[model samples]
Target: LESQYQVGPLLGSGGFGSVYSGIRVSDNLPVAIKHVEKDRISDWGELPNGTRVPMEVVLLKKVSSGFSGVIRLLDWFERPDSFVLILERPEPVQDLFDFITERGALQEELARSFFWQVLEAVRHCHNCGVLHRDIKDENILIDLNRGELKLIDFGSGALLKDTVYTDFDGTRVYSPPEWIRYHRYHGRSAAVWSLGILLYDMVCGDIPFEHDEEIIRGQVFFRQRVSSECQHLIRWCLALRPSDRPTFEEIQNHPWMQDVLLPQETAEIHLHS
Candidate 1:
């Protein structure tokens, strides 16, 4: 019964709906309950069997069990007034944005740990045939105490395809030059660009570009001096031309990532170095 679950305080809210902390009566397990109003939903994709489903639900269910870094959907219920999604609650978690605000900016080594998790999550999403159109600090959650991170908010996600996307629905601050100039961009390139911006924010405490013109003109000014290897990696991902951006596999093999290891190992090496 729906009553078996007790909804708690509001956790967060977005353009589509709100999320609340919830508890399962059976075990008192914490869960995140997300609610989306039916009337506000603009698109619901159809399954091969003709059953219609929300894209976020489809993407979540697809990645739930297989991907470790993506948020998992435990259960869902379709109500007369709204669509309810029960999600796993990673306790003591804070959004990356808030984490960065609290600490000003992270050390390069620490940022690498979080960035690697994000990259792995993005790669997993791509492997599962999904594209997370929105890849920003606010959409990523981090459990600093556990040294774990998860990508959240699949509202802007879509199935990976060969077609160029003209209608960009995600945060404009993360949009790539190709999209801003040509009004069209492929999913992978846009994702890589967003990752570069995310990485910059993690270490620099601010976005690289001040406006669309700066992004389109390939004007990236770094206020903080990071490792040369890190700067190269960021530049590679932020290339003005989509074709110049490194693929996910290439990104994983970048020199900067060579130092990324288990959290404890990383801390020890950096602490002694």
Candidate 2:
């Protein structure tokens, strides 16, 4: 029954759904309760045995348990016409979107470390045969104390495959030009492109392209005083052709990431201290 748990502050809400900060009264276990109505379900999926379930549920189960990179799914409850997902809710955390908005662009060293966490997180998703089609500042959460990064919101996730994906489920700004131009995209390529956008947004205080033309042109206008290595990384990911982008491992070994050994101390730690 909903009586045992306490649903508190509103964490997030969209056109048809919302998540509430919640707690399990028995142990005070922190959790996020995500609510979605059947009407808002774009589609339902089936397993090999023909059992039907929410894709988000399947996606989360595939990546989150014992995985440090994503928010773990605790349990779910079914209502008469809707459903609730009980998710891990770490303390003293904020979405990367809010973090960036409050602090402006981060230093290169800081951004590099943060970027490393995200790179690994996304790669883990692929390794699990799942595609977190949505990767953006708004979907990543930052742990204030540890400077850890966590991927959230698997509502747009899909099974990973090399074939062309005809549907797009992420923010347009983060979508690669190939998806826009051909109405087709490979998960790896688009994911790589979004990571490039994320890095640009992290250190530049804004997205590199504002229009489809800019994305197709593949010209990134750097407004901030960023380093050459940083610029190279961004350009490598935003290459006009999806085939030109680097693999996840390639991005990890890039020069920019070599600047710091995956920071044990996040810039957030410095700020808090």
Candidate 3:
């Protein structure tokens, strides 16, 4: 059953669904409503597994169970042809991409705070036995008022217990080289690489390589050196060999994270004249 929510302009769109800002008639609170195609409920398998996995719904509940920095999952319904998810909306911050595109550079301390928050969120997910297969800047939301970084969209997240790197699930450009052959990639290391690439973008404003069209080309030819304050850890994350990459636990204690927290004014700015 769909809620009596008044819909607003489209906020985002992707292969999975379209998200819109909506006002719930019941209480008039602003919410994000995602309308997902029902056909996408199963994994890339040809036959339906008895489990009947609702990947997004399951991941939404899983991440929301203990994480407050992520968008809150309010309610959902399975309509005949689609699934509707109601999510809590946070006050917006400058999206990292837009910030870079407009400013042409990332503030060193701000970048570190965002990266650390993302790592902390990823660490939490790992402890719960789940992997956010698609970790990217586009999926990270910054809420200005609360000074919080929120991880949004778990439509591709999965439990590591029953899966492995054999299917292609996330965006290609940010994916690790070895991941090109699988639905998932070589465990948490793949996510670390994605984070490295994301950090690179925050600092550099573009991916090191094209996603799929020339995956090998970019992986083989792209040359980036660690130069920022957290450059060493970024290098550890972008290591070509998965095993060499640091796990979230290792990431927490890495020298890079030790200096991650910046002064409040460094993380944000106020304008008054």
Candidate 4:
């Protein structure tokens, strides 16, 4: 019965659906219940012939329990109309963009904490045979009070085992050059490019691309200007050729990441202090 647990207010809503706060009926623990909008799948055609057909369920089953930082799926209810996914509650970290915009540049130490957390999460997803094709600040949840990190919203995740995706997916601001030719180009490289942009946003609070039509017209004849840090990372991420971009492992080991490791003992001591 709906009375079994208390369902709180809405956390956020998007094209995929709305997320709500709820308490489990059995243990009375707080949880986030994601109710996917039925309309989003209406146009996807019949089952087995549709792109959005049961893949979400299959993917959720694959990772729901394995990834600790990821939101755990406790239970699910499918009705004639909608899908309900009962998920574990993780602390809401402010949007990374909003956090950076408010604080300007973060202290080197603090920035290292965030960078390492993000890298670790991404690495975990990659190991699970999933490519978070849409890596962005909005999707990376911050555990501000706990100083923890989590990756959420897997509506766009793709299984990487021999997967070939040609859709022009993800936000354009973070889209790399290869992604621009999406239908013509297919691979996990696009995800790598978006990751670079995500890192760039961590440091710079904004995407490096200018969406202006006239400015883009001139880009063909002239060089585009970008921040040195952003340019360096974006160059590898946005490379026109897939082979030009660094693999996920390579990105993790890049010289830049060496500057961002947080000392475990020091962080632990500080937490105690």
Candidate 5:
């Protein structure tokens, strides 16, 4: 029940819900409380226990089981006027956007690390038959101490069906080339295109395409120099022809992703820095 957790200061607000920092009183674990109005929940999901709940809750839990890359759903309450979602809050963390702001453009090595984690998260979501149509810097959180990343917000998510979808629900910048040209597009290719956009944003510090015309042109301009391998992989994913984009497995196997050992595995952290 909502009584078990004490909601604290507002973290942020969106059209779907207002998220607030909270703590589960019994154990003092930090939680993100999202209050979604009942009227806004046009889609409902069935839990294993035969209870009807918001699709966000179902998808969040489904995607998070045993995976630290995605935020975990700690608890929830079906209140009269709204549904309260208690999500696990990673301590000492910030969204990728703010992290990029504080650090400016990310070095390719660091960007590679973050990009790999996000790719895994996206792959996991797709594996679970879920589509996080909205994948962007604002939706990914990075843990300062552990260097872990958590994907949050499933409000715009849907069950993955390998069929053409006409309507778009995600950020325009992250939308695929096919979606912009034709309202109808397949799910997997669209997700791959978003990953390409996200990778470019991480390493280059700005999205390559700012306008629909640029996106339609399907040309990406790097404001600064990035590694040839990185650029190749980015271009491969952002290929104007959806048929040419790499699959998730193909992306992971790209030379850029395959050749480098993530710093966490290859280098030691400086404790005093």
Candidate 6:
């Protein structure tokens, strides 16, 4: 497989390892190859066959099967020193973090458009029995020209189970009050909390709270003025009690998202013209 693709510049790096831009020699199709050191492996998920697989690969394969809004895993290779994951490269794209930095905050309409995609993506993950576990700007990729969003970086993801998660694997700022207070949280509720934080970051150009303590105290202040409906949706997701948060289906049907059209739907409408 290495002989079939020409690797290019480094895209990004983290605890997992470095990601590089690559292209299939036969078709010149873009790809992202993530190199993870064998020693760095810490989490594992069991397959139905009772074989163990890397947690990230397991989650990515499960989520990508049903959702186009996620970074698709094309292939993988286990080398002696490290494991290489071949992933789809959404070209003409930038991470949400850089996009936000360049444009302070997005307009309500644009934010709604992008966020609707994210909601669908997360819902798809949950439906597939997976929890992203890490939902933040940095893990999201956006098409610069069309405002399309794709959820990436499943390294922190976990398979959804009935048991509460005691280990917080995602960014600290996105953790819910229940996790910070009791060191355990339900997957769905914690995901809802992260979505709230993500929406606030997109519209306000900053996070609502600076620390876990602030989040636990339910201290959120919005500097930017978004529509009341949007604010209500945000508050609903950020509810102090996890039980008070809306389900993914309920959130999709929220007033603020009801009128929003997905990018693919908009494209289909235009194509029909």
Inter-residue clash pairs, candidate 4: 93-142
Error of 3 at 98 (Å): 3.1
Residue 269 Cα positional deviation in candidate 4, in Å, after optimal superposition = 11
Write the number of the candidate with greater TM-score, choosing between 1 and 3.
1
Best by lDDT: 2
What count of clashes does model 6 give?
0
Q: Which stretches of candidate 6 lie over 4 Å from their true place?
A: 46-51, 264-273
Candidate 3 lDDT tens digits, 79-179: 77777889987655545565567765465556677777888787777766667788887787766655567777777777655445676567778888777
- CA lDDT, every prediction? 0.84, 0.85, 0.69, 0.61, 0.83, 0.84
Supply the global lDDT for candidate 6: 0.84
- Among all windows of 10 consecutive residues in model 6, the one with the lowest summed lDDT is 264-273
- lDDT tens digits by residue: candidate 4, 133-248: 66777777655556666677666666665555666445666665544543544446766767765665655555556553421221221133334544565456656566788876
For model 5, what is the alpha-carbon lDDT of residue 122? 90
Q: Write the per-residue lDDT of candidate 2 for residues 97-204, one digit (tens) a residue.
A: 998899999888888888899988898889988999889999999776667788998887788999999987668889999888988999998999999999999999
Q: In candidate 5, where is summed lDDT lowest over 10 consecutive residues?
A: 264-273
Q: How many clashes show up per model?
A: 0, 0, 7, 1, 0, 0
Supply candidate 5's per-residue lDDT for 273. Answer: 13
Model 5: CA > 4 A from native: 259-273
Which has the better TM-score: candidate 1, or candidate 6? 1
Name the candidate that leads on TM-score: 2
TM-score for each of the candidates: 0.92, 0.94, 0.83, 0.78, 0.92, 0.92
Model 5, 1-273: lDDT tens per residue? Answer: 667888899988877879999988999999999999878775679898978788888898778787888888887888888898889997877899887787677877778788888988898899888988889999999776677778998887888897788877678988977888888778889888988999999988878887888888888888888999999999999998888999999998988996554434422341111
Model 1 compared with the native: what TM-score? Answer: 0.92
